[PDB]
Amino acid sequence: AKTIKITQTRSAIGRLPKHKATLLGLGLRRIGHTVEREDTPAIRGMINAVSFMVKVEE
Amino acid sequence: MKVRASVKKLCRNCKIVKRDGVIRVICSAEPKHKQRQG
Amino acid sequence: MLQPKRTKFRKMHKGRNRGLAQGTDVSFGSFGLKAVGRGRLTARQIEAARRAMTRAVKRQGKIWIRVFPDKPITEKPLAVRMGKGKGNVEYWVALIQPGKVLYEMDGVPEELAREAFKLAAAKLPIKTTFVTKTVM
Amino acid sequence: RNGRDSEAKRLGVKRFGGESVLAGSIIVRQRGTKFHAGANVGCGRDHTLFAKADGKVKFEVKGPKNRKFISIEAE
Amino acid sequence: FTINAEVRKEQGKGASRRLRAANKFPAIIYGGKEAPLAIELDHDKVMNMQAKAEFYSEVLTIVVDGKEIKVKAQDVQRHPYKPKLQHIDFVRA
RNA sequence: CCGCGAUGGUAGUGUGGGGUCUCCCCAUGCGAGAGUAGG
RNA sequence: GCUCAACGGAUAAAAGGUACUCCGGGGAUAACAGGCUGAUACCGCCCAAGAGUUCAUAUCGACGGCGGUGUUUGGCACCUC
RNA sequence: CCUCCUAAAGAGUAACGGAGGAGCACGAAGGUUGGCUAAUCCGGAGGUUAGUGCAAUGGCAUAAGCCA
RNA sequence: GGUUCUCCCCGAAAGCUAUUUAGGUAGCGCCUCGUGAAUUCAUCUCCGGGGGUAGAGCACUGUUUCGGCAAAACCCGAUGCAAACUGCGAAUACCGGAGAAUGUUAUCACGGGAGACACACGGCGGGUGCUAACGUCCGUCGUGAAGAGGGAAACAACCCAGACCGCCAGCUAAGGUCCCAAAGUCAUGGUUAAGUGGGAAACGAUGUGGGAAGGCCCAGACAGCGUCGAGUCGGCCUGCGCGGAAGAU
Numbered sequence: 064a065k066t067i068k069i070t071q072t073r074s075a076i077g078r079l080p081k082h083k084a085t086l087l088g089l090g091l092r093r094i095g096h097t098v099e100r101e102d103t104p105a106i107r108g109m110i111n112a113v114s115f116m117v118k119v120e121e
Numbered sequence: 122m123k124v125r126a127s128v129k130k131l132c133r134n135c136k137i138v139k140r141d142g143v144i145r146v147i148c149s150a151e152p153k154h155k156q157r158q159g
Numbered sequence: 160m161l162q163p164k165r166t167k168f169r170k171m172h173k174g175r176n177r178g179l180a181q182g183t184d185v186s187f188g189s190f191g192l193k194a195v196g197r198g199r200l201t202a203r204q205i206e207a208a209r210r211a212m213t214r215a216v217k218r219q220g221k222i223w224i225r226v227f228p229d230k231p232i233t234e235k236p237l238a239v240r241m242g243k244g245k246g247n248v249e250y251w252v253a254l255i256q257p258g259k260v261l262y263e264m265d266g267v268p269e270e271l272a273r274e275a276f277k278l279a280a281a282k283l284p285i286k287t288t289f290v291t292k293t294v295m
Numbered sequence: 296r297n298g299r300d301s302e303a304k305r306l307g308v309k310r311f312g313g314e315s316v317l318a319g320s321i322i323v324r325q326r327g328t329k330f331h332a333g334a335n336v337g338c339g340r341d342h343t344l345f346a347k348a349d350g351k352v353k354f355e356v357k358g359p360k361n362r363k364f365i366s367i368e369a370e
Numbered sequence: 371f372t373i374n375a376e377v378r379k380e381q382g383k384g385a386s387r388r389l390r391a392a393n394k395f396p397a398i399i400y401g402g403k404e405a406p407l408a409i410e411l412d413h414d415k416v417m418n419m420q421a422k423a424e425f426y427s428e429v430l431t432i433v434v435d436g437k438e439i440k441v442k443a444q445d446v447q448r449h450p451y452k453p454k455l456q457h458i459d460f461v462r463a
Numbered sequence: 464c465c466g467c468g469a470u471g472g473u474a475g476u477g478u479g480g481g482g483u484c485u486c487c488c489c490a491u492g493c494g495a496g497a498g499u500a501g502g
Numbered sequence: 503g504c505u506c507a508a509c510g511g512a513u514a515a516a517a518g519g520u521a522c523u524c525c526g527g528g529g530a531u532a533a534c535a536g537g538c539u540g541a542u543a544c545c546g547c548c549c550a551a552g553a554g555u556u557c558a559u560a561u562c563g564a565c566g567g568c569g570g571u572g573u574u575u576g577g578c579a580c581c582u583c
Numbered sequence: 584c585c586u587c588c589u590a591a592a593g594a595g596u597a598a599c600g601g602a603g604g605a606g607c608a609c610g611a612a613g614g615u616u617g618g619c620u621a622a623u624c625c626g627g628a629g630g631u632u633a634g635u636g637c638a639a640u641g642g643c644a645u646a647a648g649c650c651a
Numbered sequence: 652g653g654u655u656c657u658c659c660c661c662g663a664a665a666g667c668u669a670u671u672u673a674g675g676u677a678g679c680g681c682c683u684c685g686u687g688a689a690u691u692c693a694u695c696u697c698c699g700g701g702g703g704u705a706g707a708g709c710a711c712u713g714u715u716u717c718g719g720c721a722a723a724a725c726c727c728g729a730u731g732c733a734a735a736c737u738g739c740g741a742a743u744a745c746c747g748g749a750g751a752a753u754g755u756u757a758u759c760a761c762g763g764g765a766g767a768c769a770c771a772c773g774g775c776g777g778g779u780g781c782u783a784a785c786g787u788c789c790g791u792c793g794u795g796a797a798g799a800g801g802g803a804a805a806c807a808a809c810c811c812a813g814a815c816c817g818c819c820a821g822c823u824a825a826g827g828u829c830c831c832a833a834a835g836u837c838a839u840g841g842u843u844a845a846g847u848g849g850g851a852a853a854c855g856a857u858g859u860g861g862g863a864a865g866g867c868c869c870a871g872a873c874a875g876c877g878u879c880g881a882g883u884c885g886g887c888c889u890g891c892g893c894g895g896a897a898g899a900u
């Protein structure tokens with residue numbers, strides 16, 4: 064079962080509460096923070112929700 | 122001279138000419154038809 | 160000067176004027192004057208334009224008005240403050256969206272129709288274009 | 296001459312489809328029968344629909360008139 | 371009337387608006403037993419053709435890939451206020 | 464059990480971005496109503 | 503047993519004047535002037551009904567349309583009690 | 584105090600915003616069983632377009648309408 | 652009005668309801684401290700739900716125009732319009748269920764201590780006003796309030812971004828790279844001649860670039876057409892400019 068690397072690229076300041084909750088769900092804490100997560104539809108949906116401020120290395 | 126925002130040919134003898142960045146109507150027939158855009 | 164003969168209510172919310180028009184085809188006549196811009200047409204403007212085009216054709220052919228001013232517009236008098244209830248109805252408007260055929264004409268040549276609608280369009284606050292009936 | 300209104304009545308659906316309810320639980324408050332009482336659902340004097348058994352709420356469209364019924368599917 | 375057409379790869383609002391920005395427009399061929407075929411047309415070429423009134427009465431040929439489909443124009447969606455075509459329905463003749 | 468309907472296009476719209484910002488456009492996702500073929 | 507209706511109902515029981523005034527406060531809030539706005543006002547322009555013997559445009563510009571100024575009457579209550 | 588809209592398709596939601604009502608009535612106009620179905624136009628057509636004790640909204644033929 | 656030493660952690664509100672209440676106060680909401688407790692809570696995915704908004708539509712309730720028909724009713728065809736129209740109807744949002752990952756329990760209850768109940772601007776959806784106001788009143792999100800730093804000349808509320816302390820290290824964001832002033836007088840292909848860029852509309856015009864299609868034309872076009880020797884005419888669409896354009900140290 065593969066994993067993917069997700070990096071936060073923009074600030075959470077001024078984003079919608081749902082977007083901040085999604086960053087918390089991915090475990091992203093600050094700009095440039097990279098996390099490794101399991102590649103699932105649930106994880107991909109979180110990436111999709113905040114795709115404007117994260118980058119995936121898959 | 123008629124000084125107007127809308128300048129146009131009023132007869133067949135009217136001619137549109139641009140002189141020094143100004144649209145003008147000159148007429149060989151009728152001095153009343155002379156116009157400057159302004 | 161057009162106005163609903165009666166209405167269920169006297170005053171109406173301002174609302175907004177988004178979207179493209181319904182009634183974008185020449186449905187009755189041969190030629191049409193179509194709105195390309197967005198805005199309000201007052202009953203007075205509609206009448207002024209009608210008179211201009213009607214005079215131009217010299218009681219020849221037939222003219223349709225496709226728009227009707229059914230929206231009442233209120234105004235507050237001079238030297239009254241804000242609030243104290245909604246103002247009094249002063250005039251009626253039709254909301255116009257881009258594409259709305261405003262007037263139609265039949266039973267004249269195209270050249271005379273173009274001339275008549277040019278004279279009408281000068282009375283209107285919205286940009287317009289000349290249109291003709293299509294097969295489809 | 297205006298300036299009046301009444302208190303809002305908090306009508307509407309209280310328990311949506313698939314929700315587990317106890318007997319007595321109000322499912323919908325309404326004016327008249329906008330929804331109708333199906334299986335294991337009662338209709339109060341103010342047209343409130345309430346559960347007569349424990350179970351899951353089920354909305355359904357049945358009858359010749361094609362009416363919205365609410366039932367409880369017993370657990 | 372012969373119309374050259376390409377089969378569409380992308381569909382929907384985004385794809386369709388991109389077509390029209392590139393001076394093409396979407397169309398559909400339907401009717402008969404065969405499934406509907408979504409096509410792209412050149413705007414200027416078809417706009418010039420359909421100015422002629424015979425375009426709407428007569429049987430047309432649409433050349434798609436290397437196959438000639440006989441059709442009639444069934445419906446046209448025009449731009450609300452510009453001399454432009456948004457979409458055409460063609461019925462198989 | 465309870466007497467219609469694709470395909471395509473159009474309208475709208477969640478999120479992000481933009482403009483000439485009373486209104487729109489772009490990327491992406493969702494996508495009618497009406498009508499058409501047909502049943 | 504309450505039009506305690508000022509309807510969560512100060513008392514069983516209550517109107518006014520003050521330019522003779524007074525205190526505590528407020529630019530939380532008005533009068534002056536500034537500011538924002540520009541409906542109104544004023545000025546300019548577009549279309550051309552027509553008037554002008556003839557002739558829309560010498561001159562005037564009906565029905566309507568678009569602006570500019572900050573310039574009247576106002577709106578707001580941002581500064582100063 | 585009640586009804587509708589504003590109110591952004593759960594609830595709620597302001598203005599000296601837009602519109603209307605209440606301060607009751609009824610021992611039947613309540614309970615139940617049985618029976619019945621309107622407006623309107625010209626027996627027929629039509630199908631609730633009527634009715635609801637009284638505003639408005641949502642309901643009501645299994646009628647909540649209507650009679651014994 | 653004023654309220655006196657220090658550091659560390661968390662951190663509001665300017666709302667609802669009631670009030671002889673409205674710049675006061677009370678309960679609730681939001682802060683803090685303590686205690687206890689469930690996969691309690693959030694994000695996403697999938698599943699179960701109710702919608703009547705946006706849009707649309709015109710059977711209904713009103714409104715509307717044309718034609719036909721005819722007691723100009725009614726009816727029919729054609730065309731629109733609606734916050735208080737709906738024979739249709741989204742996106743979202745909301746309720747519930749299941750599953751994973753992530754999150755310092757982020758959740759709920761009870762108890763000790765509050766503060767707050769003048770909000771502001773900006774975005775979106777609206778009422779009001781003139782789709783006037785740095786106007787006013789709601790909903791919802793953001794920021795300011797209580798938030799420094801960089802950008803927008805200057806500029807709480809906009810854009811970027813959340814300052815534990817030190818560094819004469821490095822990479823970036825918005826925004827920039829001729830000089831003031833850090834970094835391209837960078838590369839390639841176009842456009843503009845107005846200092847347009849670096850205010851302003853209806854409307855006016857052989858400005859100038861691009862595109863598709865027409866009419867006429869060596870049976871000689873377009874002014875000369877009592878003439879000689881190839882273009883010529885004027886619509887359409889579109890890029891960038893021009894006039895329209897007057898204010899007080």
Ligand SMILES: CCC[C@@H]1C[C@@H](C(=O)N[C@@H]([C@H]2O[C@H](SC)[C@H](O)[C@@H](O)[C@H]2O)[C@@H](C)O)N(C)C1
Pocket residue numbers: 533534
């Ligand atoms: C339409 C009037 C508007 C107000 C005028 C002014 C004011 O109050 N002035 C005082 C003055 O009194 C004396 S002059 C006699 C003082 O010397 C002078 O300084 C000053 O205070 C008095 C005239 O009332 N306000 C600021 C606004």
Ligand SMILES: [K+]
Pocket residue numbers: 309310320321322
């Ligand atoms: K319940």
Ligand SMILES: [K+]
Pocket residue numbers: 508
């Ligand atoms: K009281």
Ligand SMILES: [K+]
Pocket residue numbers: none
């Ligand atoms: K006294």
Ligand SMILES: [K+]
Pocket residue numbers: 534535
């Ligand atoms: K003064």
Ligand SMILES: [K+]
Pocket residue numbers: 546547569
């Ligand atoms: K002017």
Ligand SMILES: [K+]
Pocket residue numbers: 557
């Ligand atoms: K003359």
Ligand SMILES: [K+]
Pocket residue numbers: 582583
């Ligand atoms: K003062």
Ligand SMILES: [K+]
Pocket residue numbers: 677
């Ligand atoms: K309190």
Ligand SMILES: [K+]
Pocket residue numbers: none
């Ligand atoms: K506490």
Ligand SMILES: [K+]
Pocket residue numbers: none
């Ligand atoms: K707001």
Ligand SMILES: [K+]
Pocket residue numbers: none
């Ligand atoms: K903050």
Ligand SMILES: [K+]
Pocket residue numbers: 846849
């Ligand atoms: K300049």
Ligand SMILES: [Mg+2]
Pocket residue numbers: 141
């Ligand atoms: Mg000179």
Ligand SMILES: [Mg+2]
Pocket residue numbers: 175
């Ligand atoms: Mg709206």
Ligand SMILES: [Mg+2]
Pocket residue numbers: 300
């Ligand atoms: Mg209310």
